[PDB]
Design a protein around this ligand. Structure first.
Ligand SMILES: CCCCCCCCCCCCCCCCCC(=O)OC[C@H](COP(=O)([O-])OCC(O)COP(=O)([O-])OC[C@@H](COC(=O)CCCCCCCCCCCCCCCCC)OC(=O)CCCCCCCCCCCCCCCCC)OC(=O)CCCCCCCCCCCCCCCCC
Ligand SMILES: CCCCCCCCCCCCCCCCCC(=O)OC[C@H](COP(=O)([O-])OCC(O)COP(=O)([O-])OC[C@@H](COC(=O)CCCCCCCCCCCCCCCCC)OC(=O)CCCCCCCCCCCCCCCCC)OC(=O)CCCCCCCCCCCCCCCCC
Ligand SMILES: CCCCCCCCCCCCCCCCCC(=O)OC[C@H](COP(=O)([O-])OCC(O)COP(=O)([O-])OC[C@@H](COC(=O)CCCCCCCCCCCCCCCCC)OC(=O)CCCCCCCCCCCCCCCCC)OC(=O)CCCCCCCCCCCCCCCCC
Ligand SMILES: CCCCCCCCCCCCCCCCCC(=O)OC[C@H](COP(=O)([O-])OCC(O)COP(=O)([O-])OC[C@@H](COC(=O)CCCCCCCCCCCCCCCCC)OC(=O)CCCCCCCCCCCCCCCCC)OC(=O)CCCCCCCCCCCCCCCCC
Ligand SMILES: CCCCCCCCCCCCCCCCCC(=O)O[C@@H](COC(=O)CCCCCCCCCCCCCCC)COP(=O)(O)OCC[N+](C)(C)C
Ligand SMILES: CCCCCCCCCCCCCCCCCC(=O)O[C@@H](COC(=O)CCCCCCCCCCCCCCC)COP(=O)(O)OCC[N+](C)(C)C
Ligand SMILES: CCCCCCCCCCCCCCCCCCCC(=O)O[C@H](COC(=O)CCCCCCCCCCCCCC)COP(=O)(O)OCCN
Ligand SMILES: CCCCCCCCCCCCCCCCCCCC(=O)O[C@H](COC(=O)CCCCCCCCCCCCCC)COP(=O)(O)OCCN
Lengths: 80, 82, 47, 438, 205, 71, 375
């Protein structure tokens, strides 16, 4: 779906690490290991959320085609 | 010293008015029990009510809101007297 | 900088998004009780 | 466009990584760099592309950003006035709040999606509730006023945006949609009615300006009032023209009543910031009515007069803040002899007050001429009504100037080098626009 | 338009009309039509009949309000202490007076509404405003100074809100669908449905 | 359940199953329409449950018998 | 026999974890993290769809912040009851599941109270018990009348609709929440004001329990907003917010918008997590902003789903009421922000047990842009 999901996920992992440090009173650079872990897991999670969304989009397309919605080939191209 | 709002009324008279809220307080389960029971039966009866015009429904809601007495109002003003 | 191509590509993206949303808004009831509305859906009940 | 958006996102980002002692310097450099990026956006905006100079999308309808005539003027105005706000404000907390507010507001102007516009614009709701309700010099009542007014108007706008997204399937401006419904038109209109202070929904602006800090007041007057015209040109007139033409007598009634009663309410003010804040409300009505005519003259005149206001009222607010720092008073009756005591401050104060009275060598003159011409295109009486009651502004401005000018005073209260650096850009911009480089 | 030279929006030709095209091939409706009881109650032809049909709502609301207040009083009275006065003699006036005054206000409202509509001969906002104004005037007979103004205004404003959001609002947005092609724009290429979506069955509770 | 309290099925299980089978046969797009089409089977099921029509017939016979006896 | 195995595995799992905890009970591990992980693994065997996966997610996030084997075991009991509420096909399933959940609520409330807190906590539990007995007795009496009249037990009836109105906590049935959740532990109030609702929403959507009446959701909205604005204590503010929002969600769910209510319940769980488990002012501030529906956070998306569903059904009175009541509730939320940063110096307990609180705040801030497709 979204073509910018992984980049967003990496930035949001940075958000997690820095925010967790700031809330606890520590500086943003403290606990460096948390940064790498947060970035990697957040990137993977953002990707996975995107495929889940795409899969249920396609399931809905199949259902509506069964029901009688006359989707064209281009409309079928809209749902990857 | 700073300019301050004038407080209407005397200090002791206002305190006496406020002290009329210090009365024996019933527990709220007694009200809640009856409201729950009559509300259940009321919801059962509502499905059988005739369909009313939206204008009449709104006027009935307005009248109910105006007629509703806050529980504190009865608390301050209650007298165990005829 | 081909402004015409950028304009038409952006408009096409927005129009595709609108078409996808209106397809996404076509929803019948997914209730398990509702076998009439969903008669063609492939399902198995374990009950 | 992309550079401008990236720099707008970079400014709040930098605060997280700065040393907390370099925050002021880094914030000032970031503000100037954003101004330069806005100049670059103007450079890369070709007038050949008549509908939209630039459109960028980042993967969704919500992430669609674009610049037009109104958007480009308003974005350059905010990027111009932000550095002055940065220097006026001290402390990491205050810097963070003001940077987040500016990022949200500047992203709202270039947004082309009504829902994204709503999301970015109302993100600065608590930030003003905290800002105007700060510990010692803030008032909770004013913060409550502004927050509640914004919430109700923006929620109505949001409901209209939801209905449009359901019916058309899209709420982006670039997709042509027209609606004749009056409920949706009012839902979009109420936000404009409140945000552009229009009687009787103008009560929030005064209390907010008086109890906001000088940087906060500068931003509020400079660009947050102008967000109404971005919404009107971008999200109301394209789709809701039938309703504005249906309700034009009512629109004129409300606008001219706002002008007259705001002018009369200004006469009853003893506080300098309140005087400037009420002058702003009277000034907004001409803009709103000129745009509502839906003519070429009206739109251009409204955006021009917005630029003139966003160059004149920030200067008055800045001068009043400087005087309050020097004197710890805002009451006109305490302040006397300012001509003799502060000749340099008095000169700029008189210059900006002349600008607010729309004298020819000021941008307000050109802008007012264009707006009055649009009103005259609609009807003669429409222009005549506004032209006459402009005399009320002269009365209160002259009374304030006369009260401040002379008397006996034992205090030298004149501006320092920092203060003069603060207003020099505004004076230069005012002159340059006044000679016709609008 | 998004430019400073030509007016925003657009215009549609009044001479040119577009043939209606169905939103879907087969239409299945889950919205039930008004009942005969609703049409009977809505009928304002005979003002007495209209009043007597719609007052049970007002009497019911007055009875709940009086019961609420009477229970607030009853809850307070002490069971452990024997009371010289009779509690129901104390409590019955509350409920009876609340119900009676509510019924009287609702009767004025409905009667004035039906009488104005009959005399005018048209269904309009003004009937509701006048009936509400009369009801609010009856509310504030002997009340202090702001209340002679505020209650007629509030009671008149209530039917305006009821008309605006109960009748005008639904009828203004009947055509809008949300599926297939936009109601105005069928020329655009959107997925066209054989059948409309049924998100729920007709209700029966 | 319909299991029958002794063995077999409930006393009116088969009538209800007739009504359910008729609802299964129909092609109407909503359950409400399908029930409208199959109402007569439901009337059979209600007849087996409570025997109201037979009770009314017995009441009418008893009333006419009493009227004859009095005359 | 194979279809029965799927359900039987969950039992066997729970029993062996219970007996293992009973055998391995020691002071060395009062915080039994290992049994918590075992319970979380065991609850994966009950996931069959997306709503069941949401049930699992909320159940695990709840079990993280309960302390002890015993409370975690009763949270697992609540999860079992909720899983069967979703699968109930008639009156008996609904009844069995929901009063099992009520028993779990009573036990959890009793075991998380100190000796000094017994006088009020036990009173609130007793009042909740008596009100629940009223609701269940009326439900089962009308169910007996219906089963006699129709010969069958059908979960599409007015009786189950009113019983599920009591379970949701709407219009005249919200007082038990106010009395009980004011006097119980903050975690107990948090988990039993969010998790039970998902099963009721699933049951309503799947079994066609919808009514034409809009009075109850309207009453819930207006009463909740006005009482939230008039309530002095902070717990009552948060409790009345749920009444208003669940009334609005009830109005949306009756019209068949199941997807939006299933997203709203999850976003509401995440939003309420931070204010209830208040340890930091900033986390609570973001949580309160999210509950208000405020744009930069995920709470805006959840409220937007419900409001967007409202404009589709095109009921004007509901929309007008929604706007005004939303403003009234916003005043109370602003009271909450004012109390933290703008009234007096604030000092709180250093309860450094933010298991999923930081993750929830991160999810509220971050998740807006990924989920923007929904609205
Ligand atoms: C976005 C849109 C949204 C859509 C959906 C979103 C999706 C939603 C879900 C997404 C959720 C994301 C948000 C949540 C994020 C998760 C939270 C989090 O960040 O962690 C919390 C948690 C909090 O830690 P804490 O604050 O200290 O509190 C715990 C207490 O210590 C409590 O103490 P304790 O008793 O509990 O101790 C247990 C634990 C906690 O103990 C600790 O955490 C102490 C620190 C661990 C040791 C230090 C780690 C060493 C490597 C770190 C590298 C940092 C580089 C920076 C400096 C460069 C140095 C050259 O110990 C562990 O670390 C267990 C993990 C075992 C790994 C240990 C390291 C193994 C040796 C290194 C392996 C490979 C080395 C290669 C290169 C190494 C040099 C670069 O962090 C961890 O536990 C860290 C676990 C992993 C350690 C880092 C290992 C990374 C591997 C090295 C980098 C190689 C490249 C990586 C790719 C390849 C991988 C192999
Ligand atoms: C890969 C290579 C690396 C390159 C870098 C790329 C990485 C990408 C970004 C990563 C950067 C790290 C992010 C920062 C994390 C911590 C931020 C923080 O703590 O705030 C204050 C923090 C400084 O506070 P502090 O002095 O250190 O003390 C904080 C204490 O903990 C408590 O102090 P207190 O108790 O005295 O509280 C007083 C409070 C007064 O009380 C209040 O006013 C509370 C009001 C409620 C929240 C404010 C509502 C309005 C916020 C609008 C959002 C601002 C952006 C506007 C743009 C429109 C967006 C639609 O005043 C403030 O705290 C500051 C007021 C202004 C800040 C409000 C903005 C914070 C939003 C939420 C932060 C994120 C937390 C995530 C949690 C992570 C897990 C725990 O950061 C700043 O310097 C300014 C805020 C920077 C905002 C950026 C955060 C992104 C939020 C935008 C949402 C967009 C979605 C997210 C996408 C992000 C990009 C993927
Ligand atoms: C023997 C047992 C005793 C009970 C007998 C009845 C048993 C129940 C049987 C059946 C129960 C189901 C139906 C009853 C109503 C549902 C309420 C309920 O059950 O909740 C549980 C409730 C107790 O719950 P709680 O949580 O413990 O109390 C929360 C409060 O904070 C309580 O604390 P508080 O009392 O100290 O504070 C009260 C507060 C609480 O706030 C409320 O009462 C919210 C009510 C707002 C309206 C509710 C939604 C209306 C929608 C109705 C839908 C049907 C029509 C559809 C179309 C209508 C379109 C709007 O409101 C006020 O402050 C006083 C004003 C009251 C209305 C405020 C609105 C004023 C608007 C008028 C403007 C005119 C002024 C202009 C001039 C101003 C100058 C500047 O039990 C009852 O109160 C039942 C008493 C029954 C008396 C109601 C009388 C009329 C009923 C129908 C009229 C509908 C209007 C509602 C009036 C107020 C009702 C509360
Ligand atoms: C990796 C591939 C994943 C992609 C597809 C996933 C399907 C394959 C599942 C593979 C597993 C991956 C898990 C991902 C999803 C979980 C779903 C699932 O598992 O079941 C669904 C799947 C088939 O169900 P379905 O695909 O949903 O279709 C059925 C119908 O369509 C009826 O279902 P329906 O409800 O989806 O109907 C369509 C629906 C369309 O609904 C949708 O469009 C779905 C939208 C996606 C929402 C995703 C969020 C859901 C949160 C759940 C998180 C997952 C937790 C994982 C739990 C399982 C872990 C394995 O239309 C509706 O209108 C219904 C409303 C749906 C709810 C509304 C959605 C809102 C969700 C809340 C969002 C709010 C925001 C929260 C914050 C987010 C901010 C970023 O069942 C299975 O394949 C078998 C399940 C087996 C699970 C565990 C069994 C293996 C282990 C057994 C032994 C365990 C003990 C040993 C432990 C070993 C480890 C130590
Ligand atoms: C603390 C301050 C101390 C320093 C004081 C500075 C003193 C300032 C001196 C006053 C300057 C007066 C000059 C006024 C004329 C404006 C200059 C100007 O606009 O430049 C014109 C060129 O015109 C001139 O050079 C005018 C010649 C000026 C000298 C003529 C005689 C001087 C007598 C002054 C009378 C001017 C009255 C004009 C009233 C508007 C630009 O030409 P274009 O390329 O066509 O630009 C487009 C037009 N538009 C700007 C509208 C976008
Ligand atoms: C597409 C994703 C978007 C959708 C969102 C929903 C899906 C969620 C996916 C991500 C879920 C991440 C959940 C994060 C929870 C945070 C982890 C946590 O809570 O750890 C606790 C765990 O606490 C415990 O109680 C430990 C007991 C359980 C340990 C974990 C059990 C693991 C069970 C196995 C689960 C595997 C999944 C099974 C197969 C699917 C530790 O914190 P404390 O020590 O209690 O206090 C922290 C103190 N302070 C931070 C301030 C320093
Ligand atoms: C009394 C003076 C009027 C005050 C307004 C001053 C000027 C505002 C004009 C704004 C310009 C665009 C707004 C569109 C119309 C708004 C009001 C126009 C005046 C008006 O009320 O006309 C009514 C029609 O509009 C309607 O039926 C709807 C009225 C607006 C509804 C109010 C709240 C709506 C909130 C909806 C939120 C968003 C919902 C989106 C789904 C009735 O006039 P008539 O044609 O019936 O003639 C019958 C006379 N005999
Ligand atoms: C939220 C709206 C509530 C109204 C607020 C007004 C101020 C409250 C003061 C209370 C006064 C009672 C309410 C009267 C308002 C109606 C306006 C009067 C106009 C009028 O009399 O024309 C009627 C139609 O207007 C109508 O009755 C429909 C016009 C709809 C009212 C205006 C809607 C926009 C106003 C929003 C202003 C800003 C909102 C803040 C409150 C007659 O029409 P007819 O068909 O009967 O012809 C006659 C054939 N016999």
């Amino acid at each position: 779906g979204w073509e910018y999901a992984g980049t967003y996920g990496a930035l949001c992992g940075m958000v997690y690490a820095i925010g967790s440090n700031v809330i606890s009173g520590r500086a943003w650079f403290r606990r460096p290991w948390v940064h790498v872990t947060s970035v990697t897991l957040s990137y993977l999670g953002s990707k996975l959320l995107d495929e889940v969304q795409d899969t249920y989009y396609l399931e809905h397309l199949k259902r509506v085609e069964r029901k009688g919605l006359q989707v064209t080939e281009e409309h079928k191209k809209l749902f990857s | 010293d700073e300019p301050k709002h004038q407080i209407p009324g005397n200090a002791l008279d206002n305190w006496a008015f406020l002290r009329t809220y210090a009365k024996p307080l019933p527990d709220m389960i007694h009200y809640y029990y009856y409201v729950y029971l009559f509300g259940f039966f009321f919801v059962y009866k509502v499905a059988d009510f005739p369909e009313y015009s939206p204008r009449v429904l709104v006027m009935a809601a307005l009248i109910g809101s105006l007629f509703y007495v806050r529980r504190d109002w009865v608390h301050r003003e209650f007298k165990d007297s005829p | 900088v081909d402004s015409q191509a950028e304009w038409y590509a952006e408009y096409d993206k927005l129009e595709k998004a609108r078409q996808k949303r209106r397809i996404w808004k076509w929803r019948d009831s997914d209730s398990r009780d509702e076998y009439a509305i969903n008669a063609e859906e492939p399902v198995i009940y374990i009950r | 466009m992309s550079l401008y958006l990236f720099m707008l996102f970079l400014q709040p980002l930098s605060l997280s990584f700065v040393s907390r002692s370099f925050s002021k310097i880094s914030s000032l450099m970031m503000s100037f760099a954003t101004l330069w990026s806005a100049v670059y956006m103007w450079f890369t905006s070709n007038g050949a592309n008549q509908t939209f100079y630039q459109v960028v999308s980042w993967g969704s309808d919500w992430s669609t950003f674009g610049v037009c005539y109104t958007s480009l003027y308003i974005s350059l105005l905010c990027a111009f006035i932000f550095p002055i706000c940065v220097i006026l404000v001290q402390g990491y907390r205050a810097l963070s709040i003001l940077i987040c507010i500016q990022t949200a507001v500047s992203l709202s102007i270039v947004s082309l999606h009504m829902l994204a516009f709503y999301a970015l614009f109302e993100s600065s709701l608590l930030l003003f509730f905290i800002l105007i309700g700060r510990r010692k010099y803030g008032s909770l009542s004013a913060a409550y006023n502004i927050s509640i007014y914004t919430f109700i108007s923006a929620l109505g706008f949001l409901i209209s945006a939801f209905w449009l997204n359901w019916s058309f399937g899209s709420v982006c401006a670039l997709l042509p949609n027209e609606e004749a419904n009056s409920f949706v038109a009012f839902g979009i209109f109420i936000l404009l009615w409140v945000k552009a202070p229009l009687v009787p929904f103008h009560l929030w602006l005064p209390e907010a300006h008086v109890y906001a800090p000088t940087a906060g007041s500068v931003l509020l007057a400079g660009v947050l009032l102008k967000i109404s015209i971005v919404g009107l040109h971008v999200f109301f007139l394209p789709i809701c023209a039938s309703s504005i033409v249906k309700a034009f007598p009512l629109i004129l009634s409300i606008c001219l009543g706002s002008f007259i009663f705001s002018s009369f309410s200004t006469l009853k003010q003893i506080d300098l910031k309140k005087i400037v804040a009420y002058s702003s409300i009277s000034h907004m009505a001409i803009v709103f009515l000129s745009s509502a005519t839906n003519s070429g003259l009206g739109i251009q005149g409204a955006v021009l007069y917005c630029i003139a206001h966003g160059l004149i009222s920030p200067g008055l607010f800045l001068l009043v803040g400087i005087l309050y720092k020097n004197t710890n008073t805002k009451l006109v009756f305490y302040l006397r002899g300012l001509s003799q005591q502060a000749p340099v401050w008095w000169s700029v104060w008189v210059f900006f007050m002349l600008g607010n009275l729309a004298f020819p060598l000021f941008p307000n003159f050109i802008a007012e001429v264009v707006c009055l011409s649009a009103l005259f295109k609609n009807h003669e009486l429409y222009a005549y009504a506004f032209i006459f009651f402009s005399f009320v502004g002269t009365v209160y401005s002259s009374t304030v100037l006369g009260r401040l000018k002379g008397g006996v005073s034992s205090q030298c209260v004149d501006a320092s080098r920092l203060d003069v650096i603060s207003w020099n850009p505004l004076v230069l911009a005012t002159v340059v626009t006044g000679i016709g480089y609008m | 338009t998004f430019n400073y030279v030509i007016p925003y929006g657009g215009s549609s030709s009044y001479t040119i009309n577009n043939e209606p095209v169905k939103a879907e091939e087969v239409t299945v409706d889950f919205s039930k039509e008004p009942s005969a009881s609703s049409l009977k109650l809505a009928d304002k032809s005979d003002w007495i009949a209209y009043t007597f049909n719609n007052v049970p709502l007002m009497a019911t609301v007055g009875l709940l309000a009086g019961a609420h207040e009477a229970f607030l009083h009853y809850e307070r009275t002490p069971i452990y202490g024997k009371r010289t006065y009779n509690i129901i003699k104390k409590l019955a006036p509350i409920v009876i007076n609340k119900t009676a005054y509510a019924t009287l206000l609702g009767a004025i409202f409905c009667a004035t509404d039906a009488l104005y509509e009959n005399y005018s001969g048209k269904k309009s906002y003004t009937s509701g405003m006048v009936a509400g104004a009369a009801t609010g005037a009856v509310f504030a007979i002997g009340r202090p100074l702001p209340q002679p103004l505020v209650w007629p205004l509030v009671f008149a404003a209530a039917p305006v809100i009821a008309d605006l959001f109960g009748e005008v609002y639904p009828e203004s947005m009947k055509s809008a669908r949300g599926y297939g092609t936009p109601y105005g724009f069928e020329n655009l290429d959107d997925a066209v449905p054989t059948r409309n979506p049924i998100r729920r069955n007709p209700h029966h509770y | 359940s319909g299991f029958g309290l002794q063995s077999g099925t409930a006393r009116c299980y088969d009538w209800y199953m007739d009504y359910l089978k008729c609802m299964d046969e129909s092609k109407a797009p909503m359950i409400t329409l399908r029930k409208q089409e199959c109402s007569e089977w439901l009337e059979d099921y209600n007849e087996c449950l409570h025997r109201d029509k037979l009770k009314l017939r017995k009441l009418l016979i008893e009333r006419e018998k009493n009227k004859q006896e009095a005359a | 026999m194979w279809e029965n195995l799927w359900y039987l595995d969950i039992l066997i799992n729970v029993l062996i974890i219970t007996i293992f905890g009973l055998i391995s009970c020691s002071s060395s591990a009062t915080k039994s993290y290992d049994l918590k992980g075992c319970f979380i693994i065991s609850m994966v065997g009950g996931v069959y769809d997306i709503p069941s996966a949401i049930l699992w997610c909320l159940a695990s996030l709840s079990i993280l912040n309960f302390n002890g084997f015993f409370a975690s075991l009763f949270l697992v009991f609540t999860w079992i009851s909720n899983l069967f509420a979703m699968q109930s096909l008639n009156f008996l399933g609904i009844y069995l599941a929901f009063e099992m959940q009520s028993l779990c609520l009573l036990v959890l409330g009793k075991i998380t109270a100190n000796e000094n807190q017994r006088w009020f906590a036990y009173r609130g539990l007793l009042k909740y018990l008596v009100l629940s007995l009223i609701a269940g007795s009326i439900f089962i009496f009308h169910a007996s009348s219906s089963y006699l009249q129709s010969g069958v037990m059908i979960s599409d009836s007015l009786v189950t609709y009113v019983f599920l109105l009591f379970k949701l906590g709407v219009a005249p049935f919200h007082m038990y929440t106010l009395e009980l959740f004011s006097v119980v532990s903050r975690h107990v109030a948090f988990v039993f004001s969010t998790l039970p609702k998902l099963s009721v929403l699933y049951l309503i959507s799947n079994s066609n329990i919808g009514s034409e009446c809009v009075w109850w959701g309207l009453i819930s909205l207006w009463l909740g907003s006005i009482s939230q604005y008039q309530s002095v204590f902070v717990r009552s503010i948060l409790l009345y917010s749920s009444v208003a929002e669940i009334g609005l969600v009830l109005l949306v769910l009756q019209e068949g918008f199941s997807w939006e209510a299933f997203s709203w319940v999850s976003i509401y769980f995440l939003s309420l997590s931070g204010v209830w488990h208040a340890n930091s002012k900033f986390v609570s501030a973001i949580s309160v902003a999210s509950i208000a529906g405020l744009p930069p956070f995920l709470g805006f998306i959840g409220k937007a789903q419900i409001l967007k569903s409202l404009v589709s059904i095109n009921l004007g009175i509901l929309i007008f009421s929604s706007i005004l009541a939303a403003t009234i509730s916003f005043i109370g939320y602003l009271r909450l922000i004012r109390l933290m940063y703008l009234v007096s110096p604030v000092k709180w307990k250093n309860n450094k047990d933010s298991s999923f609180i930081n993750w929830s705040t991160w999810m509220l801030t971050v998740g807006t842009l990924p989920m923007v497709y929904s609205v």
